[PDB]
Write a protein that holds these residues in place. Structure first.
Motif, PDB file in Angstrom:
ATOM      1  N   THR A  12      -6.791  -4.962   2.573  1.00 58.37           N
ATOM      2  CA  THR A  12      -6.119  -6.111   2.613  1.00 58.37           C
ATOM      3  C   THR A  12      -5.082  -5.989   3.816  1.00 58.37           C
ATOM      4  O   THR A  12      -4.226  -6.611   4.195  1.00 58.37           O
ATOM      5  N   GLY A  13      -5.048  -4.724   4.034  1.00 57.10           N
ATOM      6  CA  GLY A  13      -4.286  -4.283   5.225  1.00 57.10           C
ATOM      7  C   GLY A  13      -4.151  -5.144   6.622  1.00 57.10           C
ATOM      8  O   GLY A  13      -5.109  -5.763   6.992  1.00 57.10           O
ATOM      9  N   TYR A  14      -3.232  -4.652   7.385  1.00 58.02           N
ATOM     10  CA  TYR A  14      -3.362  -5.269   8.654  1.00 58.02           C
ATOM     11  C   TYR A  14      -4.508  -5.046   9.762  1.00 58.02           C
ATOM     12  O   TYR A  14      -5.074  -5.947   9.995  1.00 58.02           O
ATOM     13  N   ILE A  15      -4.898  -3.427   9.704  1.00 57.58           N
ATOM     14  CA  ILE A  15      -6.375  -3.589  10.255  1.00 57.58           C
ATOM     15  C   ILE A  15      -7.298  -3.510   9.348  1.00 57.58           C
ATOM     16  O   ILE A  15      -8.484  -3.497   9.817  1.00 57.58           O
ATOM     17  N   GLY A  16      -7.198  -3.292   8.076  1.00 57.32           N
ATOM     18  CA  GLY A  16      -7.996  -3.137   7.072  1.00 57.32           C
ATOM     19  C   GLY A  16      -8.933  -4.390   6.791  1.00 57.32           C
ATOM     20  O   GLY A  16      -9.970  -4.260   6.606  1.00 57.32           O
ATOM     21  N   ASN A  17      -8.201  -5.602   6.887  1.00 54.22           N
ATOM     22  CA  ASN A  17      -8.869  -6.793   6.752  1.00 54.22           C
ATOM     23  C   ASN A  17     -10.124  -7.080   7.696  1.00 54.22           C
ATOM     24  O   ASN A  17     -10.922  -7.897   7.469  1.00 54.22           O
ATOM     25  N   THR A  34      -7.947  -2.644  -4.165  1.00 50.21           N
ATOM     26  CA  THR A  34      -6.788  -3.412  -4.123  1.00 50.21           C
ATOM     27  C   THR A  34      -5.991  -3.271  -5.327  1.00 50.21           C
ATOM     28  O   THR A  34      -6.384  -3.181  -6.439  1.00 50.21           O
ATOM     29  N   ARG A  35      -4.609  -3.235  -5.151  1.00 49.93           N
ATOM     30  CA  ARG A  35      -3.499  -3.124  -6.364  1.00 49.93           C
ATOM     31  C   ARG A  35      -3.417  -4.220  -7.168  1.00 49.93           C
ATOM     32  O   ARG A  35      -3.599  -5.502  -6.536  1.00 49.93           O
ATOM     33  N   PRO A  36      -3.367  -4.343  -8.353  1.00 45.82           N
ATOM     34  CA  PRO A  36      -3.237  -5.357  -9.363  1.00 45.82           C
ATOM     35  C   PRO A  36      -2.256  -6.340  -9.118  1.00 45.82           C
ATOM     36  O   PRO A  36      -2.152  -7.764  -9.013  1.00 45.82           O
ATOM     37  N   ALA A  78      -7.901   2.637   5.202  1.00 46.66           N
ATOM     38  CA  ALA A  78      -6.910   2.080   6.047  1.00 46.66           C
ATOM     39  C   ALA A  78      -5.557   1.894   5.561  1.00 46.66           C
ATOM     40  O   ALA A  78      -4.965   0.938   5.716  1.00 46.66           O
ATOM     41  N   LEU A  79      -4.996   3.024   4.789  1.00 45.81           N
ATOM     42  CA  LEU A  79      -3.868   3.066   4.217  1.00 45.81           C
ATOM     43  C   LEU A  79      -2.876   3.226   4.977  1.00 45.81           C
ATOM     44  O   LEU A  79      -3.071   3.762   6.239  1.00 45.81           O
ATOM     45  N   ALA A  80      -1.626   2.795   4.726  1.00 45.62           N
ATOM     46  CA  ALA A  80      -0.473   2.973   5.560  1.00 45.62           C
ATOM     47  C   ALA A  80       0.045   4.405   5.475  1.00 45.62           C
ATOM     48  O   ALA A  80      -0.175   5.332   4.710  1.00 45.62           O
ATOM     49  N   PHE A 108      -7.048   5.819  12.946  1.00 40.97           N
ATOM     50  CA  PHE A 108      -6.745   4.524  13.950  1.00 40.97           C
ATOM     51  C   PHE A 108      -5.663   4.640  14.733  1.00 40.97           C
ATOM     52  O   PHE A 108      -4.916   3.421  14.795  1.00 40.97           O
ATOM     53  N   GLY A 109      -5.259   5.603  15.396  1.00 39.30           N
ATOM     54  CA  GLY A 109      -4.126   5.588  16.270  1.00 39.30           C
ATOM     55  C   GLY A 109      -4.284   6.569  17.483  1.00 39.30           C
ATOM     56  O   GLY A 109      -5.259   6.449  18.197  1.00 39.30           O
ATOM     57  N   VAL A 110      -3.507   7.672  17.932  1.00 39.78           N
ATOM     58  CA  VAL A 110      -3.780   8.382  18.833  1.00 39.78           C
ATOM     59  C   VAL A 110      -4.610   9.520  18.364  1.00 39.78           C
ATOM     60  O   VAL A 110      -4.763   9.718  17.243  1.00 39.78           O
ATOM     61  N   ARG A 127       0.570  15.630   9.070  1.00 44.45           N
ATOM     62  CA  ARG A 127       0.037  14.985   7.633  1.00 44.45           C
ATOM     63  C   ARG A 127      -1.505  14.773   7.617  1.00 44.45           C
ATOM     64  O   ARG A 127      -2.439  15.223   7.256  1.00 44.45           O
ATOM     65  N   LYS A 128      -1.884  13.826   8.897  1.00 43.60           N
ATOM     66  CA  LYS A 128      -3.170  13.432   9.008  1.00 43.60           C
ATOM     67  C   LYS A 128      -4.035  14.771   9.202  1.00 43.60           C
ATOM     68  O   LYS A 128      -5.077  14.646   8.874  1.00 43.60           O
ATOM     69  N   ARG A 129      -3.438  15.742   9.855  1.00 41.39           N
ATOM     70  CA  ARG A 129      -4.204  16.977  10.318  1.00 41.39           C
ATOM     71  C   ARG A 129      -4.285  17.715   8.918  1.00 41.39           C
ATOM     72  O   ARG A 129      -5.443  18.284   8.656  1.00 41.39           O
ATOM     73  N   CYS A 149      -4.117   1.899  20.936  1.00 46.05           N
ATOM     74  CA  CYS A 149      -3.068   0.701  20.538  1.00 46.05           C
ATOM     75  C   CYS A 149      -3.707  -0.568  20.032  1.00 46.05           C
ATOM     76  O   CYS A 149      -4.611  -1.164  20.692  1.00 46.05           O
ATOM     77  N   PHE A 150      -3.187  -1.105  19.027  1.00 44.13           N
ATOM     78  CA  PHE A 150      -3.614  -2.213  18.312  1.00 44.13           C
ATOM     79  C   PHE A 150      -3.022  -3.406  19.416  1.00 44.13           C
ATOM     80  O   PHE A 150      -1.910  -3.499  19.515  1.00 44.13           O
ATOM     81  N   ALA A 151      -4.016  -4.016  20.210  1.00 38.86           N
ATOM     82  CA  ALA A 151      -3.744  -5.079  21.026  1.00 38.86           C
ATOM     83  C   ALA A 151      -2.858  -6.359  20.682  1.00 38.86           C
ATOM     84  O   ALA A 151      -1.821  -6.526  21.353  1.00 38.86           O
ATOM     85  N   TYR A 153      -1.145  -6.694  18.204  1.00 34.72           N
ATOM     86  CA  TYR A 153       0.041  -6.099  17.573  1.00 34.72           C
ATOM     87  C   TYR A 153       1.199  -5.798  18.849  1.00 34.72           C
ATOM     88  O   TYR A 153       2.234  -5.989  18.763  1.00 34.72           O
ATOM     89  N   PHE A 154       0.476  -5.096  19.875  1.00 35.44           N
ATOM     90  CA  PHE A 154       1.344  -4.480  20.840  1.00 35.44           C
ATOM     91  C   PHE A 154       1.622  -5.894  22.109  1.00 35.44           C
ATOM     92  O   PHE A 154       2.659  -5.730  22.793  1.00 35.44           O
ATOM     93  N   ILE A 155       0.930  -6.597  22.156  1.00 34.43           N
ATOM     94  CA  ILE A 155       0.987  -7.785  22.938  1.00 34.43           C
ATOM     95  C   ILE A 155       2.407  -8.550  22.423  1.00 34.43           C
ATOM     96  O   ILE A 155       3.088  -8.951  23.213  1.00 34.43           O
ATOM     97  N   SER A 307       4.616  -6.096  11.946  1.00 42.23           N
ATOM     98  CA  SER A 307       5.214  -5.043  11.838  1.00 42.23           C
ATOM     99  C   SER A 307       4.543  -3.866  10.871  1.00 42.23           C
ATOM    100  O   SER A 307       4.539  -4.226   9.809  1.00 42.23           O
ATOM    101  N   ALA A 308       4.394  -2.646  11.331  1.00 43.33           N
ATOM    102  CA  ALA A 308       3.797  -1.653  10.553  1.00 43.33           C
ATOM    103  C   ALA A 308       5.134  -1.037   9.456  1.00 43.33           C
ATOM    104  O   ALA A 308       5.996  -1.152   9.825  1.00 43.33           O
ATOM    105  N   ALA A 309       4.541  -0.509   8.395  1.00 49.39           N
ATOM    106  CA  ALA A 309       5.413   0.099   7.362  1.00 49.39           C
ATOM    107  C   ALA A 309       5.637   1.589   7.572  1.00 49.39           C
ATOM    108  O   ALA A 309       4.463   2.359   7.866  1.00 49.39           O
TER     109      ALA A 309
END
Ligand SMILES: NC(=O)c1ccc[n+]([C@@H]2O[C@H](COP(=O)([O-])OP(=O)(O)OC[C@H]3O[C@@H](n4cnc5c(N)ncnc54)[C@H](OP(=O)(O)O)[C@@H]3O)[C@@H](O)[C@H]2O)c1
Length: 310
Positions: A12-17, A34-36, A78-80, A108-110, A127-129, A149-151, A153-155, A307-309
């Motif tokens: 249900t996330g920004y990129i997840g959907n 998804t969370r209850p 696709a968690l935050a 999903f970034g750099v 952390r990702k590593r 970059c999420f387009a 989003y950044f435009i 805006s990302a969390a």
């Protein structure tokens, strides 16, 4: 039938959907955890009408996760950023289940294993590593996606199209190059490669040649599109650097991303490695929406800012 069953966390996330929609559009049986205490009730209803199977629960429900892992083939996270190490709960279930064919952690970034940013961002990359090392250590089949970059989003962020201001803020010199891709394509492509043998245990980078640009160039083109010249106001790099040191957390994190993106240009400061896969080249029937097309969309029907969390 033969379609791999896909399980998406953060759906249900920004990129997840977008991953959920592309998965369904591709005829893939799609599970959405998804969370209850879900507040994305209307979006979940939409997924449901699209044919998705909704699974409410907490990441702490280890047994639920295990029994769920057993019914699917592919797992996409696709968690935050706040829930990055929680992915170890997803990882533990996959390990116990043992039948997962592919795992896509939440990147999903750099490209984290080839760029270095300020301490704030450097910490999140570390952390990702951590996750990556754990995946390979256990020999879990994966795919590391650097979507750049999420387009939309950044435009919205850089051009503020929902604001008739006469000035526009430029970070650093604005000469730094970066690549930005439409969220809808990032979703669709992520699903494609998650089943593409060509991406198995590989780093996939989303960098179509038609989506590379600098802040100034982006501004200049937006100007021609709408026929309006803006007054440019630069934020010196040295100031951005000081802020990352002064501002608290998480406030200082997006400040470090900005420096890495638009000042350092970490999404273009590297050349492709031998084993790297650039996704635009994978499918002749598919193409990434280009920048011009993106600017057209923001003219005819601009998507809302986000805006990302942290
Ligand atoms: N490259 C770029 O330009 C860019 C931009 C933004 C984000 N990103 C990246 O994309 C990835 C996802 O970002 P995002 O903004 O799409 O995520 P998001 O929308 O902030 O969150 C994704 C989902 O996490 C679930 N969630 C939230 N809090 C939770 C909690 N406390 N415990 C368990 N689940 C929780 C929510 O789903 P439910 O309500 O269904 O549980 C939420 O919809 C990250 O790795 C991020 O760094 C990249």
């Amino acid at each position: 039938g033969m379609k791999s069953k896909i399980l998406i966390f953060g759906g249900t996330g920004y990129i997840g959907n977008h991953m959920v929609k592309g998965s369904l559009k591709l005829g893939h049986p799609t599970y959405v955890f998804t969370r209850p205490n879900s507040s994305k009730t209307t979006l979940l209803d939409e997924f449901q009408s699209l044919g998705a199977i909704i699974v409410k629960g907490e990441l702490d429900e280890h047994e639920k996760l295990v029994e769920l892992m057993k019914k699917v083939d592919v797992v996409i996270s696709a968690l935050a950023v706040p829930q990055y190490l929680d992915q170890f709960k997803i990882l533990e279930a996959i390990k116990v289940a043992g039948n997962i064919k592919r795992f896509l952690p939440s990147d999903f970034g750099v490209e984290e294993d080839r760029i270095n940013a300020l301490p704030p961002f450097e910490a999140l990359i570390e952390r990702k590593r951590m996750i990556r090392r754990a995946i390979e250590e256990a020999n879990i089949p994966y795919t590391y996606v650097s979507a750049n970059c999420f387009a939309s989003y950044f435009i919205n962020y850089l051009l503020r199209p929902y604001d008739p201001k006469d000035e526009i803020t430029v970070y650093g010199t604005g000469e730094a190059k970066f690549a930005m891709n439409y969220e809808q394509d990032i979703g669709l492509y992520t699903i494609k490669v998650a089943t593409d043998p060509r991406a198995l245990n590989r780093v996939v980078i989303y960098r179509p040649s038609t989506n590379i640009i600098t802040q100034l160039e982006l501004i200049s083109r937006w100007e021609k599109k709408i026929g309006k010249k803006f007054k440019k106001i630069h934020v010196p790099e040295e100031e951005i650097v000081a802020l990352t040191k002064e501002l608290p957390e998480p406030e200082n994190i997006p400040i470090a991303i900005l420096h890495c993106l638009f000042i350092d240009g970490a999404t273009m400061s590297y050349d492709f490695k031998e084993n790297d896969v650039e996704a635009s080249t994978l499918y002749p029937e598919l193409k990434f929406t280009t920048i011009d097309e993106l600017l057209d969309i923001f003219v005819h029907d601009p998507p809302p800012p986000a805006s990302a969390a942290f």
